[PDB]
Design an enzyme around this catalytic site. Structure first.
Site, mmCIF file in Angstrom:
data_model
loop_
_atom_site.group_PDB
_atom_site.id
_atom_site.type_symbol
_atom_site.label_atom_id
_atom_site.label_comp_id
_atom_site.label_asym_id
_atom_site.label_seq_id
_atom_site.Cartn_x
_atom_site.Cartn_y
_atom_site.Cartn_z
ATOM 1 N N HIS A 40 -4.922 -24.543 -36.032
ATOM 2 C CA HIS A 40 -3.716 -25.078 -36.663
ATOM 3 C C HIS A 40 -3.186 -26.319 -35.948
ATOM 4 O O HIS A 40 -2.396 -27.064 -36.514
ATOM 5 C CB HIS A 40 -2.623 -24.001 -36.836
ATOM 6 C CG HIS A 40 -1.879 -23.657 -35.585
ATOM 7 N ND1 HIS A 40 -2.114 -22.500 -34.873
ATOM 8 C CD2 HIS A 40 -0.893 -24.310 -34.929
ATOM 9 C CE1 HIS A 40 -1.297 -22.454 -33.836
ATOM 10 N NE2 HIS A 40 -0.548 -23.545 -33.844
ATOM 11 N N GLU A 52 -1.564 -33.577 -16.687
ATOM 12 C CA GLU A 52 -0.148 -33.694 -16.980
ATOM 13 C C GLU A 52 0.609 -32.619 -16.249
ATOM 14 O O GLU A 52 0.136 -31.488 -16.111
ATOM 15 C CB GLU A 52 0.100 -33.563 -18.474
ATOM 16 C CG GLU A 52 -0.268 -34.808 -19.250
ATOM 17 C CD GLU A 52 0.778 -35.899 -19.128
ATOM 18 O OE1 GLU A 52 1.537 -35.863 -18.125
ATOM 19 O OE2 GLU A 52 0.843 -36.782 -20.021
ATOM 20 N N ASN A 54 4.663 -33.460 -15.953
ATOM 21 C CA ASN A 54 5.776 -33.934 -16.732
ATOM 22 C C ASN A 54 5.184 -34.708 -17.877
ATOM 23 O O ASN A 54 4.702 -35.820 -17.659
ATOM 24 C CB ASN A 54 6.689 -34.844 -15.891
ATOM 25 C CG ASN A 54 7.964 -35.242 -16.631
ATOM 26 O OD1 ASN A 54 7.974 -35.378 -17.869
ATOM 27 N ND2 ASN A 54 9.048 -35.431 -15.881
ATOM 28 N N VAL A 57 6.897 -38.330 -18.513
ATOM 29 C CA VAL A 57 6.858 -39.340 -17.463
ATOM 30 C C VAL A 57 5.393 -39.547 -17.091
ATOM 31 O O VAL A 57 4.707 -38.600 -16.705
ATOM 32 C CB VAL A 57 7.699 -38.882 -16.242
ATOM 33 C CG1 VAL A 57 7.355 -39.680 -15.002
ATOM 34 C CG2 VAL A 57 9.189 -38.996 -16.578
ATOM 35 N N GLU A 62 -2.665 -39.450 -14.847
ATOM 36 C CA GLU A 62 -3.107 -38.674 -15.989
ATOM 37 C C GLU A 62 -4.306 -39.316 -16.610
ATOM 38 O O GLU A 62 -4.635 -40.484 -16.321
ATOM 39 C CB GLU A 62 -2.051 -38.647 -17.075
ATOM 40 C CG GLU A 62 -0.766 -37.964 -16.721
ATOM 41 C CD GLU A 62 0.224 -38.905 -16.096
ATOM 42 O OE1 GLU A 62 -0.182 -39.912 -15.443
ATOM 43 O OE2 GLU A 62 1.416 -38.617 -16.259
ATOM 44 N N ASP A 84 -8.190 -18.883 -35.368
ATOM 45 C CA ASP A 84 -7.363 -20.029 -35.042
ATOM 46 C C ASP A 84 -7.904 -20.596 -33.744
ATOM 47 O O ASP A 84 -7.373 -20.367 -32.651
ATOM 48 C CB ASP A 84 -5.912 -19.594 -34.886
ATOM 49 C CG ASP A 84 -4.978 -20.763 -34.767
ATOM 50 O OD1 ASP A 84 -5.445 -21.869 -35.117
ATOM 51 O OD2 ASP A 84 -3.802 -20.586 -34.343
ATOM 52 N N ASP A 169 8.123 -15.299 -23.668
ATOM 53 C CA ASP A 169 7.142 -15.555 -24.742
ATOM 54 C C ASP A 169 6.642 -17.011 -24.738
ATOM 55 O O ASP A 169 7.250 -17.881 -24.126
ATOM 56 C CB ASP A 169 7.759 -15.189 -26.114
ATOM 57 C CG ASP A 169 6.716 -14.993 -27.244
ATOM 58 O OD1 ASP A 169 5.474 -15.079 -27.014
ATOM 59 O OD2 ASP A 169 7.167 -14.755 -28.391
ATOM 60 N N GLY A 173 5.142 -25.543 -29.745
ATOM 61 C CA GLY A 173 4.786 -26.513 -28.733
ATOM 62 C C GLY A 173 3.762 -25.919 -27.807
ATOM 63 O O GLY A 173 3.060 -26.647 -27.124
ATOM 64 N N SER A 175 1.279 -23.897 -28.812
ATOM 65 C CA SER A 175 0.021 -23.723 -29.561
ATOM 66 C C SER A 175 -1.177 -24.411 -28.961
ATOM 67 O O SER A 175 -1.092 -25.530 -28.475
ATOM 68 C CB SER A 175 0.155 -24.204 -30.997
ATOM 69 O OG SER A 175 0.709 -23.185 -31.802
ATOM 70 N N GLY A 176 -2.309 -23.733 -29.030
ATOM 71 C CA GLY A 176 -3.559 -24.301 -28.561
ATOM 72 C C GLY A 176 -3.736 -23.990 -27.096
ATOM 73 O O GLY A 176 -4.868 -23.948 -26.598
HETATM 74 CA CA LIG Z 1 2.913 -37.179 -17.075
#
Ligand SMILES: [Ca+2]
Lengths: 221, 46
Positions: A40, A52, A54, A57, A62, A84, A169, A173, A175-176
């Site tokens: 999805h 990553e 933050n 920022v 990264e 999924d 939980d 955001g 997801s995956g």
């Molecule tokens: Ca960052």
């Protein structure tokens, strides 16, 4: 992640953010070229963001790497969210050590404590999107309690993890994103009824069922 | 239900609330706001 805590930088090196302009899904690096995520989470022009903490920022270290292929499971059902699971291939190989997470050889059993991570909402009630990666220790819940929480909605390719009591939980955001237990990627953040609700645990894709397909898909792509 | 995927796809409700995805919008509509409608993608203006 609701009711969780700050992972710490580099503590979840296989956690990736899928970005199409904004963070929208998590993913797990499973080798330097491949990410698993939720089907999805499929978008065209995914940029995978690695190393990553933050998300908001740019620390400067990264890796922002475009998805070259995004391969949903060919049994992925967007209506039931069965299967999924999605494999994303990186345009170029990630620079390691960022690190991959092992795939399971066995399924995990009810009770296994897992690490779930993401930059999803941190609030049940309002919205609170974090900047730094958030983590949640949560146990895989019994199948029968997963299914009683979600009657008719749980397939053998799903498990619940978290707390029936509520308050802790994954969330929109997330997801995956990974559920990693005993050093193995066992779950992908999939869905749930709201977030951190009483008797509505997170429902995750059961990665162990997909190890052969992931391997066949990676070997042939 | 109201069972939503946990993808972030911020949308804007007719109530001027930002919903985390079309689905959570759909849930709020189904829970207490029948006339709730998606106005546009992205967050609402406050
Ligand atoms: Ca960052």
């Amino acid at each position: 992640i609701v009711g969780g805590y700050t992972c710490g930088a580099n503590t979840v090196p296989y956690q990736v953010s899928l970005n199409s302009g904004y963070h929208f899904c998590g993913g797990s690096l499973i080798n330097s070229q491949w990410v698993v995520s939720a089907a999805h989470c499929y978008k065209s022009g995914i940029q995978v963001r690695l190393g990553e903490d933050n998300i908001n920022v740019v620390e400067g270290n990264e890796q922002f790497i475009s998805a070259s292929k995004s391969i949903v499971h060919p049994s992925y059902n967007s209506n039931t969210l069965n299967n999924d699971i999605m494999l994303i291939k990186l345009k170029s190989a990630a620079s390691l050590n960022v690190a991959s997470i092992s795939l399971p050889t066995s399924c995990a059993s009810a009770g296994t404590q897992c690490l779930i991570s993401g930059w999803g909402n941190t609030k049940s009630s309002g919205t609170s999107y974090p900047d730094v990666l958030k983590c949640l220790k949560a146990p895989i819940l019994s199948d029968s309690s997963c299914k009683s929480a979600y009657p008719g909605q749980i397939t053998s390719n799903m498990f619940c993890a978290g707390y029936l009591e509520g308050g802790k939980d994954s969330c929109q955001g997330d997801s995956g994103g990974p559920v990693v237990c005993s050093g193995k990627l066992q779950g992908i953040v999939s869905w749930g009824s709201g977030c951190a609700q009483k008797n509505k645990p997170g429902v995750y894709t059961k990665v162990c069922n997909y190890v052969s397909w992931i391997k066949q898909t990676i070997a042939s792509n | 239900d109201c069972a939503c995927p946990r993808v972030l796809h911020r949308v804007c409700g007719s109530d001027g609330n930002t919903y985390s995805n079309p689905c959570t919008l759909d849930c709020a509509k189904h829970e207490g706001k029948p006339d709730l409608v998606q106005v546009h993608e992205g967050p609402c203006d406050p």
